[PDB]
Write an enzyme that holds these catalytic residues in place. Sequence first.
Site, mmCIF file in Angstrom:
data_model
loop_
_atom_site.group_PDB
_atom_site.id
_atom_site.type_symbol
_atom_site.label_atom_id
_atom_site.label_comp_id
_atom_site.label_asym_id
_atom_site.label_seq_id
_atom_site.Cartn_x
_atom_site.Cartn_y
_atom_site.Cartn_z
ATOM 1 C CD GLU A 35 74.100 86.686 127.686
ATOM 2 O OE1 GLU A 35 74.557 86.398 126.781
ATOM 3 O OE2 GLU A 35 72.884 87.006 128.313
ATOM 4 C CG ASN A 46 77.861 91.230 119.863
ATOM 5 O OD1 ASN A 46 78.539 91.310 120.469
ATOM 6 N ND2 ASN A 46 76.831 90.028 119.963
ATOM 7 C CG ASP A 48 78.663 96.517 118.507
ATOM 8 O OD1 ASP A 48 78.472 95.099 118.747
ATOM 9 O OD2 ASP A 48 79.030 97.334 119.105
ATOM 10 C CB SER A 50 81.185 94.652 120.245
ATOM 11 O OG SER A 50 80.009 94.519 119.990
ATOM 12 C CG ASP A 52 78.327 89.491 122.974
ATOM 13 O OD1 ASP A 52 78.450 90.865 123.992
ATOM 14 O OD2 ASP A 52 77.674 89.271 122.427
ATOM 15 C CG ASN A 59 79.398 94.016 124.192
ATOM 16 O OD1 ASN A 59 80.283 95.609 124.039
ATOM 17 N ND2 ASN A 59 79.516 93.138 123.004
#
EC number: 3.2.1.17
Length: 129
Positions: A35, A46, A48, A50, A52, A59
């Site tokens: 990750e 991301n 959309d 958002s 992380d 997120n």
Amino acid sequence: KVFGRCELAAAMKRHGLDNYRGYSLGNWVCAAKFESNFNTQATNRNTDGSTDYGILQINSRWWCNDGRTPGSRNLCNIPCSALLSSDITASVNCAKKIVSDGNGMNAWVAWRNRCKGTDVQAWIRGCRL
């Protein structure tokens, strides 16, 4: 901060992640590996909108608050920047909320795809724990 493999396993163990909700310690350490690459300051935006955050790439949409993700919940009730600390306490507390939710560690794609079904114990092989 960038963690060592074993430094991290230990920190996660004292923070009660070892065997939490059925997931043995190797699972967590591996998820961490893919990750964030053991790096606490890792961020990824991301599509959309958002982002992380941190060791376990949590997120902004559901779990924290970064002030630039519209319609967000803040289910762990923290600012999102608190997940970038070298103290992994907030990351760990918030991970336990996520994992207890319904999909277990499948909530993490890197785990689902890179760890699920693997000998995840290799990841703690030869650490003083």
